[PDB]
Structures are given as C-alpha cells and as structure tokens.
Amino acid sequence: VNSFSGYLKLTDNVYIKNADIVEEAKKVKPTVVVNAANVYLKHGGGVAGALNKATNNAMQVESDDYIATNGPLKVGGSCVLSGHNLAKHCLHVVGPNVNKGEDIQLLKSAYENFNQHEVLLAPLLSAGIFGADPIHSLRVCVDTVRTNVYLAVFDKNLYDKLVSSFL
Numbered sequence: 118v119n120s121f122s123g124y125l126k127l128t129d130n131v132y133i134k135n136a137d138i139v140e141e142a143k144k145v146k147p148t149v150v151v152n153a154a155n156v157y158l159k160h161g162g163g164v165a166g167a168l169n170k171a172t173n174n175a176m177q178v179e180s181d182d183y184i185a186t187n188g189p190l191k192v193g194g195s196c197v198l199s200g201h202n203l204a205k206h207c208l209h210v211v212g213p214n215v216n217k218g219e220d221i222q223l224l225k226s227a228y229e230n231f232n233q234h235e236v237l238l239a240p241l242l243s244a245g246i247f248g249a250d251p252i253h254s255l256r257v258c259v260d261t262v263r264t265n266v267y268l269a270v271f272d273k274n275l276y277d278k279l280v281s282s283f284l
C-alpha cells in the first residue's frame with residue numbers, strides 16, 4: 118500500500134491520472150520522481166522546467182555540477198540525483214526528442230531505466246515538447262516497465278484520450 122490517490126489502473130503495475138506532476142510530487146513526496154530530461158540536464162521547459170522551478174533552481178545547480186563532472190547523458194540513459202523538496206530522488210531520464218531527429222526506438226531503452234526502482238511517479242517520456250505520440254509512449258511504458266509506475270498526464274484532454282484509446 119502506498120499514498121498515491123485517484124489513479125486509474127491500466128495493468129498489474131501501471132497507473133495513470135490527469136495531474137500536474139509538480140503538485141503530485143509535493144503532495145506524495147515519492148521515493149522517486151522521474152524528470153523528462155535532456156542529455157545536458159538543461160531544465161528549461163516542459164516537465165523539466167516545471168520541476169526545476171519548483172526546486173527554486175536547486176535542481177539546475179546540482180545538474181550543472183553533475184554535467185561538469187560526468188559529461189552529458191546518453192539518449193535513452195538516466196542518472197539519479199536529489200529530489201530536493203519534491204521527492205527523495207529524481208531519476209532524470211532522456212527519451213528521444215523527435216523535434217531533434219532522435220530515434221524513437223530509443224524510447225524503450227529510456228523506459229528500461231524505470232525498472233531499477235520499485236515505485237516511481239513519472240511523466241510520459243518523449244511526449245509533450247519532445248514531439249512523440251503520447252499514445253505510443255504509453256504503450257511502450259506498459260510493455261517495458263515492470264515496476265510500479267504512477268503516470269501523471271498534465272493535459273486533461275490528452276488524459277481522456279489516452280484512457281479511451283488504451284488497449
């Protein structure tokens with residue numbers, strides 16, 4: 118039993134809700150919140166810009182030190198950093214950005230990172246400003262993640278479409 122509330126159950130392990138991931142994290146304080154990161158951990162917009170803003174830019178400061186030490190992530194890769202005031206940890210995961218010409222096949226590799234964590238609060242990878250089809254992203258999530266994932270979909274209209282089209 119966990120403290121996530123109001124989610125629709127899609128499968129044995131995947132749950133979904135129309136919610137702002139920032140406000141959800143602040144309420145639940147999950148062990149792991151997933152960020153929709155880029156390889157440079159430059160948290161400018163989308164989920165990443167919103168999460169970083171909620172940390173008063175502490176996420177960005179920590180991320181800049183991470184990159185200075187380690188260099189960029191791989192597309193499909195991830196790193197674990199602090200969750201600041203939002204969660205214990207933030208799993209920064211890089212899904213392919215279609216608006217950069219990146220291979221959508223890397224989306225499965227991106228979701229595989231979730232399997233290293235028993236429970237996560239997460240967005241749909243590569244959706245939104247990353248340019249991929251959110252219906253497809255949800256399918257890859259369900260077919261790849263085996264740990265318990267609580268998905269927050271910001272757009273209410275999209276949430277209804279994701280639910281109504283889910284197979």
Ligand SMILES: O[C@H]1CC[C@@H]2CCN(c3ncnc4[nH]ccc34)[C@@H]21
Nearest residue numbers: 137138164167240241244245269271
């Ligand atoms: O699930 C994500 C997949 C792509 C969509 C674009 C934004 N995004 C968000 N989801 C949840 N909370 C959010 N806060 C701020 C943004 C945001 C969606």
